[PDB]
Design an enzyme around this catalytic site. Structure first.
Site: not given
Ligand SMILES: CCCCCCCCCCCCCCCCCC(=O)OC[C@H](COP(=O)([O-])OCC(O)COP(=O)([O-])OC[C@@H](COC(=O)CCCCCCCCCCCCCCCCC)OC(=O)CCCCCCCCCCCCCCCCC)OC(=O)CCCCCCCCCCCCCCCCC
Ligand SMILES: CCCCCCCCCCCCCCCCCC(=O)OC[C@H](COP(=O)([O-])OCC(O)COP(=O)([O-])OC[C@@H](COC(=O)CCCCCCCCCCCCCCCCC)OC(=O)CCCCCCCCCCCCCCCCC)OC(=O)CCCCCCCCCCCCCCCCC
Ligand SMILES: CCCCCCCCCCCCCCCCCC(=O)OC[C@H](COP(=O)([O-])OCC(O)COP(=O)([O-])OC[C@@H](COC(=O)CCCCCCCCCCCCCCCCC)OC(=O)CCCCCCCCCCCCCCCCC)OC(=O)CCCCCCCCCCCCCCCCC
Ligand code: HEA
Ligand code: HEA
Ligand SMILES: CCCCCCCC/C=C\CCCCCCCC(=O)OC[C@H](COP(=O)(O)OCCN)OC(=O)CCCCCCC/C=C\CCCCCCCC
Ligand SMILES: CCCCCCCC/C=C\CCCCCCCC(=O)OC[C@H](COP(=O)(O)OCCN)OC(=O)CCCCCCC/C=C\CCCCCCCC
Ligand SMILES: CCCCCCCC/C=C\CCCCCCCC(=O)OC[C@H](COP(=O)(O)OCCN)OC(=O)CCCCCCC/C=C\CCCCCCCC
Ligand SMILES: [O-][O-]
Ligand SMILES: [Cu+2]
Ligand SMILES: [K+]
Ligand SMILES: [Zn+2]
Ligand SMILES: [Zn+2]
Ligand SMILES: [Zn+2]
Lengths: 107, 226, 65, 459, 196, 180, 121
Positions: D60, D90, D125, D152-153, D228, D230, D232, D243, D277-278, D303, D306, D428
């Site tokens: 998941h 293109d 995960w 790919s990323s 982390h 990731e 963001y 926006s 912080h993790h 943050t 915005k 969890r």
């Protein structure tokens, strides 16, 4: 910050005492899903879609100039749905400055 | 232009092996019927024939001299078209900046088709606003809804064709007196004698008029191995 | 050509064969099965049942059913 | 053709299509989890098949993060509009764009095939060793999928960076959002690859990094140094969409464009330096904990700027315009929902509060409110805005107030109770729990079944 | 000042008429440059040597005619006749007489507008100025209204927050009395269960 | 009024599910034999031969469009000379009733209005300052509490007893000093 | 106060009522709302007010409901959501009677304070 174009009082003076603000409707019209005819084939339905583009529409003012459909971003400038090749002629972003050169003028 | 890559060797001159072998018909073909390679060699053969005849240059008018070299005398019609062509090409890889557009002098938006996407950024300084994109279609005097900047589309269209240097040259240049092959031979003998060729193009051209392989060393010049 | 102007012209002009849509939904349905079928298979492999009975791993009353 | 196409807009459609397909598998797994957690006992998973639950939660998470939301917000909408926003014909790298989507599909097939063929076990995960390295071959297959996805990323990130060289207009905020995510990927992915290779070395090459005298906490540093950034990389594209939608639909120019852009840049730099912080409960040094806690709280400043700039975009807009369009509702809902997720993030940022709330369902609800609600709704809102341009039909979404209301209500029924059980406390990554936590778990489960039913009404 | 001074394209000459730099593999032939300088004379030295173009004298009358018809061109033609024109002098002549192409706005067809419409141009401009005046004033008006409203939200958020402050305040008072007075607090009460 | 009734006639209800007869009754998969439609199937969709099997991008049916003079056909504008001036009449799109169906009458009025901009530069700058520094103040208000609570966990205490706790799969081992 | 102190070039309505008008409306029907406050068929244009005669910049305001039901309509003629009511009628009243406005606001705030404090406490 942007606060509109600057206005001089001289430019707010009318040439007639009856001048008011032009009441032209900027609602383009009543629309819905584009409705294709059954008789039309793939080629003729493409022509139909190209003739229903809101971004090709405008409003004509009392002096004959037209205010076009405008957008903040160029995403709304391609045909809907987007064709395979969109900006064949490079879109031109017009910048303004006060510089000038003599060759452009004639006396 | 900055967007173009580096000059090719061909951009300066073409190899003599690309000269059409039927020179007699080449010099009699009308300009509208000459292709790019044929037009290159028509102008080079005729232009160098007049330039390599010093005794006749002082008595030749600029109108006739320009015709021989294949240069187009400029006029307002052709200047307008060429100028708008070069302005279109420049805008391909350059920014679009100019004076504020008004009804008297709209912003000129060159295009080949019937439409070009344009953005209005307003005036200078505080009169500049966020980009407002619109589709500039021909036959309408556009007014920005925000700053009232007037725009107009200019189409590079002429008789079912767009504007090109070739089109401008064909439409406005007029073919003069038919080129005389006697001049080619006369100049050929002037600069080419006794195994010295000081007009290589005229040695090859005269050889073709003679039928290919007639002049000394030309059979050996035309014999290739791959 | 006019037919080639729009990407996926048949779908956009509403002439596409419905089978394309059916395959897309079927592909999604198969993707979903990858979470359910191995659940049933693994349950049977380690227990002998495809799915449990609620609270059958705990003590149940005599009349529980 | 279908697979050979290089058109950047077609590939964008492929990314959205594949995200929905893979998303079906993701949602199904979520339904399994919530069904199981409806009461105490075994409901749909046998006690002898508890390893399957561990695999369900692992897949998941991995699928929703790397195969659904990332391909949808960083691959789908970006590949379709970015070259248009940049007034370029293109995408800069046509052939690379084609292979990227094919790579994503191939890595998905590997993962799901590993479900069917391999023994089903799970390690989260976050693939913490030593548990990840003492597992069966399914862990090896998942590692191959992640590495392949990483390829790919990175190539897609290279593709977007090249737009700076060709952009013919102005770099809009959305373009800035993608560019910065691309930078975050270029800097974070190479570190992830290294640590993943070390997991492989211990699994497959008899390496000893994650056995005694080797520090297992090392993995957590390198993993979360990507982890982390990731989160963001997954949210910044959503911000870019929000926006555009607010400015377009309200007919209002973006306010503080440069502050929006500089807020995105700031979030990236800060997000690249707050990963630990993790790792608050591992036992790091006092000064390290204080540094990371301090810098984590700083991220709220950019943050926050915005959020307030978005609010003023909606304020003052003309009343005559109809405000019930689904895209506008979703964009507004994002502000309301993101604030909840972010504030709870600041709560967990305090390490002493975190001691109580680490590895509890409070963390779950926190990142669900941002991703499962905020990111999903942002992707939906973006696609909805481009409905005319994309051209899809056969759905009733564009103007559907019932769908928006039902989704908002039921999604909150699922995750709001998970904040409560966080203080009860329910760990969890568990399936069985004490009988005194059933009420809240039951309420959330009722919410999950209901949300699924609402997904059928769109057709 | 580009490519290190190396010209992208340049002429090379060979003394042997049948020489081919690709087929032959001899080691005695020395290539020359466009001016004829042998390759073994370095560029730093050859570029100092002054090279001038020599046209056949039969061209002098033509070059004279050019100077007279265009007096600005005369100094360059005189240099060429006298054999004093270097490559740089030729370049100066070439670029001095290059002119830009001219565009005439009077030749552009205009979008169709009736004479009635053309007489309303001042009116439309007048409307546009009043729209900009009303826009600018409204910006100040709206900014004042909404930013002032945001204060209501601050005050509403300060009231609701204070409710939890009071609950927390009472909570701490209660906690201080638990271990001191609350009968719920029991000591010497819990006994070890022992192993089962 | 009901605008649907205006264009009801154009919308004739359909007969076939998904708008196609069974392939047996009519083979829509085959290429059309009609002259000039060799690139289309019978049902009007593009044929696989035209798009896949013999796609021009792959080198099939090579036909360069540009002519010898480097020109392609271009349609000119609608030019109308008048009042000693050459004019171009722009192409106006057809009525939206033709393309969409609804009759273009009783349209609600949406007046022209220039962009809704926030004014009062000085006021706006102060708000933007607050948008940034009000959160900064709150963070600073948490900073001191965060330091204190962190220091509290990491305090050297005079502990008098030790309990060792080892976690194994799946149970917790406890080692405690035994009374002497 | 935009018309009162800021801008003198927009038409200024008369307040018909400082309370909304309750009316039953039907989907598929178009209604015309009085923007001058002088119509005798409030909240609709009567054919004799400024709006009907297109006098002094006053025009009827077109409105159409999506669904059938009872809807509140603006009587003060200045509500932001006009023709529909959103509370601007009360706001405009407070501008005209600031002492009364304070009384109502205090009473509303007093009730809100008591209830929220009583439940949380
Ligand atoms: C999250 C969910 C909810 C979301 C809600 C919100 C949504 C919001 C809107 C989002 C919009 C996004 C953007 C949309 C853009 C659309 C663009 C588009 O239309 O492009 C055109 C594109 C193609 O159109 P075209 O241009 O006409 O194409 C012509 C073809 O190229 C050429 O035509 P052709 O006929 O020649 O085609 C070739 C054809 C030829 O086809 C045939 O011959 C078919 C014959 C019939 C087969 C039928 C299936 C048979 C299955 C049998 C199973 C047996 C099981 C037995 C079990 C026994 C157990 C005991 O196919 C093939 O040969 C290959 C097919 C490959 C795909 C199918 C794979 C199926 C699964 C296979 C699994 C295998 C597992 C193996 C495991 C092995 C393990 C060892 O459209 C599509 O592809 C269809 C798209 C349809 C949906 C569009 C979106 C609509 C809006 C959303 C609706 C909700 C969707 C929710 C998700 C799905 C839920 C299930
Ligand atoms: C030194 C020693 C050396 C020794 C050497 C020895 C020899 C070594 C050989 C090594 C190489 C071997 C392999 C050779 C590959 C050649 C490729 C090539 O050049 O092809 C040209 C060839 C061109 O064909 P053509 O001859 O011109 O004729 C084409 C057709 O007439 C019609 O044109 P077309 O292009 O449209 O045809 C394809 C198209 C025809 O169908 C359509 O047009 C489809 C329309 C849409 C229907 C709905 C699709 C479902 C929604 C998908 C949404 C996401 C899309 C993502 C992006 C696209 C993904 C394909 O689609 C398909 O048939 C497949 C569609 C799959 C869609 C995604 C399904 C996801 C399901 C998830 C659950 O390519 C193709 O057309 C087919 C390529 C097929 C590649 C398949 C790879 C599958 C891998 C699966 C996983 C493998 C691991 C696990 C397997 C487990 C099995 C139980
Ligand atoms: C006298 C009445 C008031 C009595 C009490 C006063 C108490 C003292 C307050 C300070 C003094 C205020 C004095 C004002 C005098 C008038 C000034 C003035 O300019 O008057 C004209 C001016 C407007 O006149 P106008 O411009 O002519 O237009 C007339 C219209 O009526 C236009 O009207 P409007 O647009 O101004 O309408 C007001 C509306 C404007 O605002 C809205 O309508 C916005 C509504 C957005 C809703 C978005 C959806 C939210 C759903 C969230 C669901 C979350 C579920 C999951 C949670 C998970 C948690 C783990 O306000 C609301 O709807 C109230 C929003 C309240 C906050 C909502 C959030 C509460 C959160 C609570 C804690 C939650 C904790 C858990 C969550 C996580 C925490 C980190 O009137 C006002 O300013 C009236 C303000 C009234 C405020 C009432 C608040 C009641 C509820 C309080 C709770
Ligand atoms: C896109 C998803 C996303 C986003 C945006 C965030 C954003 C944030 N997250 Fe994250 N987080 C996750 C996804 C996300 N997170 C996931 C998936 C996990 C768990 C992974 C796992 O453990 O397996 C996680 C875990 C996680 C933890 C671990 C808790 C634990 O392990 O016990 C912590 C604690 O530091 C944290 C903090 C934060 C903070 C401080 C922010 C900030 O970005 C929030 C900033 C936003 C605001 C603060 C609100 C808006 C700003 C204002 C309204 C201004 C005013 C506010 C203030 C002045 C405070 N997150
Ligand atoms: C973005 C990723 C994402 C998304 C969408 C979701 C969505 C959901 N998740 Fe999430 N979840 C995670 C990422 C995500 N989750 C992660 C990373 C973990 C931790 C993994 C771990 O513990 O190891 C987790 C853990 C997790 C658990 C904890 C199990 C455990 O470890 O004990 C639970 C159940 O309580 C749960 C439930 C749900 C539910 C009920 C939904 C949703 O079903 C709620 C309803 C919403 C929808 C059904 C809409 C979703 C639609 C799409 C995603 C498609 C969008 C596509 C387009 C718009 C084109 N999730
Ligand atoms: C107890 C009570 C249980 C009640 C369960 C209710 C389930 C309801 C499911 C609803 C499914 C809806 C499917 C759907 O809408 O598909 C749409 C989609 C697209 O169609 P259109 O949108 O019309 O596109 C054409 C052009 N417009 O249709 C399709 O593709 C049809 C696909 C049908 C596939 C059916 C496959 C069924 C397989 C069942 C497997 C069961 C396995 C059981 C294993 C048990 C082991 C012990
Ligand atoms: C773990 C191992 C990971 C291995 C990853 C290898 C690939 C890394 C990325 C390489 C750089 C990619 C890139 O952007 O290069 C562009 C350039 C191609 O550009 P075009 O698409 O043709 O665009 C034309 C523009 N005029 O890339 C290439 O040539 C790539 C060639 C090799 C394939 C690399 C990508 C696929 C992965 C290969 C894995 C083996
Ligand atoms: C892109 C931005 C990259 C920034 C990399 C450096 C960030 C450092 C943040 C400061 C963290 C800190 O306090 O460092 C301690 C902390 C470890 O602390 P303890 O486990 O408690 O050990 C201390 C001694 N027993 O350091 C780390 O983990 C840093 C790891 C190295 C990061 C290097 C990244 C390089 C990227 C290129
Ligand atoms: O992770 O925040
Ligand atoms: Cu984090
Ligand atoms: K359970
Ligand atoms: Zn403008
Ligand atoms: Zn009236
Ligand atoms: Zn009112």
């Amino acid at each position: 910050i942007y606060e509109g174009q600057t206005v001089q009082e001289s430019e707010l003076i009318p040439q007639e005492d009856d001048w008011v603000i032009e009441e032209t409707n900027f609602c383009l019209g009543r629309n819905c899903y584009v409705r294709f005819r059954e008789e039309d084939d793939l080629a003729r339905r493409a022509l139909h879609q190209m003739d229903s583009q809101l971004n090709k529409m405008h409003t004509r003012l009392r002096d004959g100039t037209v205010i076009p459909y405008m957008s903040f971003h160029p995403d709304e400038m391609v045909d809907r749905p987007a064709p395979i090749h969109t900006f064949s002629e490079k879109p031109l972003l017009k910048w303004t400055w006060d510089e000038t050169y003599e060759e452009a003028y004639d006396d | 232009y900055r967007h173009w890559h580096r000059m090719s060797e061909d951009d300066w001159a073409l190899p003599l092996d690309s000269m059409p072998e039927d020179v007699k018909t080449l010099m009699a073909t009308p300009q509208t019927e000459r292709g790019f390679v044929e037009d290159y060699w028509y102008n080079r053969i005729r232009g160098e024939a007049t330039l390599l005849d010093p005794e006749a240059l002082p008595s030749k008018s600029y109108i006739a001299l320009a015709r021989d070299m294949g240069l187009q005398i400029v006029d307002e019609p052709s200047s307008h078209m060429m100028g708008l062509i070069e302005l279109y090409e420049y805008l391909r890889g350059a920014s679009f900046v100019g004076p504020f557009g008004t009804i008297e002098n709209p912003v000129l938006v060159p295009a080949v088709g019937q439409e070009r996407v344009v953005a209005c950024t307003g005036g200078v300084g505080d009169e500049e606003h966020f980009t407002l994109w619109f589709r500039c279609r021909e036959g309408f005097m556009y007014r920005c809804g925000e700053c009232d900047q007037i725009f107009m589309l200019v189409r590079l269209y002429y008789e079912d064709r767009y504007w090109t240097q070739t089109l401008v040259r064909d439409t406005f240049m007029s073919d003069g007196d038919m080129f005389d092959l006697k001049t080619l031979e006369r100049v050929h003998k002037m600069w080419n004698k006794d195994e010295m060729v000081r007009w290589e193009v005229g040695y090859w051209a005269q050889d073709y008029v003679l039928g290919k392989g007639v002049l000394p060393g030309m059979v050996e010049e035309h014999t290739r191995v791959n | 050509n006019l037919e080639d102007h729009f990407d996926l012209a048949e779908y956009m002009m509403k002439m596409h064969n419905p089978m394309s849509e059916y395959l897309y939904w079927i592909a999604g349905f198969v993707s979903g099965l990858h979470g359910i079928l191995p659940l049933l298979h693994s349950n049977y492999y380690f227990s002998g049942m495809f799915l449990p009975r609620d609270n059958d791993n705990t003590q149940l009353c005599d009349d529980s059913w | 053709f279908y697979i050979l196409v290089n058109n950047n807009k077609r590939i964008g459609i492929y990314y959205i299509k594949l995200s929905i397909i893979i998303g079906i598998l993701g949602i199904v797994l979520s339904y399994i989890i919530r069904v199981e957690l409806y009461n105490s006992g075994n409901r749909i998973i046998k006690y002898d098949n508890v390893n399957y639950y561990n695999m369900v939660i692992t897949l998941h998470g991995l699928l929703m993060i790397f195969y659904i939301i990332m391909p949808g917000l960083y691959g789908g909408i970006p590949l379709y509009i970015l070259p248009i926003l940049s007034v370029i014909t293109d995408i800069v790298l046509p052939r690379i764009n084609n292979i990227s989507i094919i790579i994503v599909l191939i890595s998905y097939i590997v993962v799901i095939n590993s479900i069917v063929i391999e023994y089903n076990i799970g390690t989260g995960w976050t693939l913490y060793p030593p548990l990840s390295i003492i597992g069966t071959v399914i862990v090896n297959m998942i590692l191959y999928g992640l590495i392949i996805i990483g390829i790919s990323s990175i190539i897609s990130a290279i593709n977007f960076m090249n737009i700076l060289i060709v952009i013919d207009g102005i770099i809009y905020v959305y373009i800035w959002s993608i560019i910065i995510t691309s930078v975050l990927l270029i800097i974070s992915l190479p570190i992830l690859n290294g640590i993943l290779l070390m997991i492989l070395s211990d699994i497959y090459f008899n390496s000893i990094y994650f056995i005694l005298n080797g520090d297992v906490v090392l993995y957590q540093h390198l993993f979360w140094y990507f982890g982390h950034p990731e989160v963001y990389i997954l949210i910044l594209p959503a911000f870019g969409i929000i926006s555009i939608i607010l400015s377009v639909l309200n007919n209002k120019i973006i306010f503080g464009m440069k502050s929006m852009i500089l807020a995105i840049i700031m979030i990236s730099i800060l997000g690249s330096i707050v990963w630990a912080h993790h790792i608050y409960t591992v036992g790091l040094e006092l000064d390290t904990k204080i540094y990371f806690n301090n810098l984590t709280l700083i991220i709220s400043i950019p943050t926050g700027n915005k959020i307030y700039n978005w609010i003023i975009l909606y304020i003052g807009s003309y009343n005559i315009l109809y405000n019930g369009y689904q895209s506008l509702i979703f964009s507004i809902m994002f502000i309301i929902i993101f604030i909840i997720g972010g504030i709870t993030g600041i709560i967990i940022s305090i390490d002493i509060i975190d001691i109580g709330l680490h590895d509890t369902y409070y963390i779950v609800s926190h990142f669900h409110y941002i991703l499962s609600i905020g990111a999903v709704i942002s992707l939906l809102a973006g696609i909805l805005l481009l409905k005319d341009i994309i051209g899809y039909y056969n759905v009733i979404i564009k103007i559907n107030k019932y769908f928006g209301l039902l989704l908002f209500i039921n999604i909150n029924i699922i995750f709001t109770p998970q904040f409560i059980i966080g203080f009860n406390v329910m760990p969890r990554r568990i399936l069985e729990y004490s009988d005194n936590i059933i009420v809240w778990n039951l309420i959330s489960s009722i919410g999950s079944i209901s949300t699924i039913l609402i997904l059928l009404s769109i057709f | 000042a580009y490519n290190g001074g190396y010209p992208f394209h340049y002429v090379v000459q060979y003394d042997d008429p049948n020489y081919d730099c690709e087929a032959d593999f001899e080691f005695e032939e020395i290539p020359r440059d466009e001016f004829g300088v042998p390759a073994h004379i370095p560029p730093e030295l050859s570029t100092q040597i002054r090279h001038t173009y020599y046209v056949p004298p039969q061209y002098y009358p033509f070059l004279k005619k050019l100077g007279e018809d265009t007096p600005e061109l005369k100094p360059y033609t005189d240099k060429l006749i006298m054999g004093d024109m270097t490559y740089d002098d030729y370049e100066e002549m070439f670029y001095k007489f290059a002119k830009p192409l001219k565009i005439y706005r009077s030749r552009l067809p205009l979008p169709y507008r009736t004479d009635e419409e053309i007489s309303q141009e001042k009116y439309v401009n007048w409307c546009g100025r009043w729209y900009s005046y009303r826009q600018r004033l409204q910006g100040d008006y709206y900014s004042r209204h909404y930013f002032r409203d945001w204060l209501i939200g601050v005050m509403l958020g300060m009231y609701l927050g204070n409710l939890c402050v009071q609950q927390h305040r009472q909570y701490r008072v209660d906690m201080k009395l638990f271990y001191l007075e609350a009968p719920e607090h029991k000591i010497n009460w819990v006994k070890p269960r022992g192993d089962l | 009024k009901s605008y649907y009734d205006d264009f009801k006639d154009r919308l004739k209800p359909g007969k076939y599910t998904q708008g196609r007869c069974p392939q047996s009754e009519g083979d829509y998969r085959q290429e059309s034999k009609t002259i000039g439609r060799e690139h289309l199937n019978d049902d009007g969709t593009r044929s696989k031969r035209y798009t896949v099997k013999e796609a021009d991008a792959l080198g099939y049916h090579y036909h360069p469009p540009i002519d010898k003079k480097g020109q392609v056909y271009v349609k000119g504008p609608n030019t109308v000379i008048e009042r000693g001036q050459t004019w171009i009449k722009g192409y106006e799109l057809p009525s939206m009733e033709y393309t969409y169906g609804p009759k273009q009458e009783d349209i609600p009025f949406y007046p022209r209005v220039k962009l809704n901009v926030w004014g009062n530069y000085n006021l706006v700058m102060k708000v933007e300052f607050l948008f940034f520094y009000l959160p900064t103040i709150i963070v600073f208000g948490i900073c001191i509490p965060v330091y204190t609570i962190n220091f509290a966990q990491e305090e050297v205490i005079y502990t008098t007893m030790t309990v060792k706790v080892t976690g194994r799969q799946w149970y917790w081992v406890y080692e405690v000093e035994s009374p002497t | 106060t935009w018309t009162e102190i800021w801008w003198e070039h927009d038409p200024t309505p008369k307040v018909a009522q400082y309370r909304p008008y309750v009316c039953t409306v039907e989907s598929g029907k178009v209604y015309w709302w009085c923007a001058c406050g002088e119509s005798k068929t409030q909240p609709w244009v009567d054919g004799h007010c400024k709006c009907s005669k297109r006098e002094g910049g006053f025009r009827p305001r077109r409105w159409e409901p999506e669904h059938d039901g009872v809807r509140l309509f603006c009587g003060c003629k200045s509500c932001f959501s006009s023709p529909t009511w959103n509370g601007g009628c009360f706001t405009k009243w407070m501008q005209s009677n600031p002492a009364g406005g304070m009384l109502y606001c205090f009473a509303a705030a007093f009730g809100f304070g008591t209830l929220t404090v009583y439940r949380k406490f």
